[PDB]
Design an enzyme around this catalytic site. Structure first.
Site, short mmCIF file in Angstrom:
data_model
loop_
_atom_site.label_atom_id
_atom_site.label_comp_id
_atom_site.label_asym_id
_atom_site.label_seq_id
_atom_site.Cartn_x
_atom_site.Cartn_y
_atom_site.Cartn_z
N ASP A 9 0.85 -1.13 0.00
CA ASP A 9 0.09 0.05 0.20
C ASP A 9 0.97 1.30 -0.24
O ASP A 9 1.77 1.05 0.92
CB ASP A 9 -1.03 0.05 1.08
CG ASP A 9 -1.96 1.14 1.19
OD1 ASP A 9 -1.93 2.04 0.42
OD2 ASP A 9 -3.12 0.95 1.78
N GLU A 105 -2.55 -0.31 -4.42
CA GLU A 105 -2.31 -1.24 -3.76
C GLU A 105 -2.57 -2.55 -4.39
O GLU A 105 -3.23 -2.59 -5.61
CB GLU A 105 -3.23 -1.43 -2.35
CG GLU A 105 -4.79 -1.08 -2.80
CD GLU A 105 -5.66 -1.18 -1.42
OE1 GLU A 105 -5.46 -0.16 -0.49
OE2 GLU A 105 -6.20 -2.03 -1.07
#
Ligand SMILES: [Mg+2]
Ligand SMILES: [Mg+2]
Ligand SMILES: [Mg+2]
Length: 342
Positions: A9, A105
């Site tokens: 992320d 992500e």
DNA sequence: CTAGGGTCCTAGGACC
DNA sequence: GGTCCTAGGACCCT
């Protein structure tokens, strides 16, 4: 039979790219979002702005009252798409088991990976370091035996850090984990669950599956499972886009059909250009329109239709404008398309 | 003081 | 009873 799932992320993704590309923004509070005059919201903000309370999805007026010196950027989506491509190619050096969830992500299944002596912890670390070295952006990661735990884990030690949950650790981890932290349990559901004494996964473990099923449908099964660490969803890697849509919130509400039509005439070339990148012949399964009134109610009408067509989108907008506006003003107009199945 | 880009689930009636 | 058509809405990301 335990898998190793990585969730990667990017940190303050849109903001981080603006700072990399313009270091003058590094230490002042910045945010990507529409302006107060545009009735916009904050897409994201850097850490100097979050210090003041600025958060994603906040109305920009609220962001500016909390942080009067916020510098507001419009967003460079080609720059973000570029960085997104690069991190996915970096993921592919380590495994083809890559399931991206948005630009910034992705899940990785490295159960069968031979890098870093099979250490998922060391792989995540190598990926974050390889993302810093070649993109000058930082990333966080989570390692866990199932998807949702790995994604919770990547949030816990950000920015520029990671967190590991081994199987021995998951029952202690779950016992006080707030339900609202599970991806897919949102504000409405968390408030329902709260209103009957269910706040953490530990609370839900004390609940009967049959009760949860009646009270929540398939959502109740998901709740019952996640509260015990059960999440057998596979990392896909073959998911495909199903729709494309273009919509605009106007700075001022509109009240006349000519205004609505003028707006569609500008939205349509944008919808066509974007559909065409993925479907040159414009062949689609459905097309339709979206209106959001001033009472914030929203309606859509879409229908089976074989090819992107502007006049049908205007005609459908016309019926919706007459048949369910009820004299309210309209703050948003949207066009929409549903893509054929293969 | 409330975006824009999406995915997915539910639900009723049509159609088979 | 399945499956499709359509609308609404919760939810995800920045
Ligand atoms: Mg992020
Ligand atoms: Mg993200
Ligand atoms: Mg976020």
């Amino acid at each position: 039979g335990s898998r190793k799932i990585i969730h990667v992320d990017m940190d303050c993704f849109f903001a981080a790219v603006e700072m990399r590309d313009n270091p003058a923004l590094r230490d002042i509070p910045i945010a990507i979002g529409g302006s107060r005059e545009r009735r916009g919201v904050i897409s994201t903000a850097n850490y100097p702005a979050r210090k003041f309370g600025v958060r994603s999805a906040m109305p920009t007026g609220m962001a500016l009252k909390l942080c009067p010196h916020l510098t507001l950027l419009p967003g460079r989506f080609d720059a973000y798409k570029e960085a997104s491509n690069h991190i996915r190619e970096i993921f592919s050096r380590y495994t083809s088991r890559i399931e991206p969830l948005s630009l910034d992500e992705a899940y990785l299944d490295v159960t069968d990976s031979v890098h870093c002596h099979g250490s998922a912890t060391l792989i995540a670390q190598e990926i974050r370091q390889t993302i810093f070295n070649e993109l000058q952006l930082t990333a966080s990661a989570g390692v866990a035996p199932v998807k949702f735990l790995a994604k919770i884990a990547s949030d816990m030690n950000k920015p520029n850090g990671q967190f590991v949950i081994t199987p021995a650790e998951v029952p202690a981890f779950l016992q006080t984990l707030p339900l609202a932290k599970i991806p897919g349990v949102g504000k409405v559901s968390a408030a329902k669950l709260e209103a009957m004494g269910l706040r953490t996964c530990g609370d839900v473990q004390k609940c009967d599956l049959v009760m949860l099923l009646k009270r929540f449908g398939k959502f109740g099964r998901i709740l019952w499972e996640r509260s015990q660490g059960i999440d057998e969803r596979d990392v896909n890697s073959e998911r495909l886009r199903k729709s494309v849509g273009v919509e605009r919130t106007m700075a001022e509400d509109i009240h006349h059909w000519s205004e609505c039509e003028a707006i569609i005439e500008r939205l349509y070339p944008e919808l066509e250009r974007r559909l065409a990148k993925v479907k040159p012949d414009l062949l689609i399964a459905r097309q339709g329109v979206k209106l959001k009134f001033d009472d914030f109610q929203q309606t859509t009408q879409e229908h089976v239709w074989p090819r992107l067509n502007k006049a049908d989108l205007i005609a459908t907008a016309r019926k919706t404008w007459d048949e369910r506006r009820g004299g309210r003003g309209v703050r948003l107009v949207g066009l929409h398309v549903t893509l054929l199945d293969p």
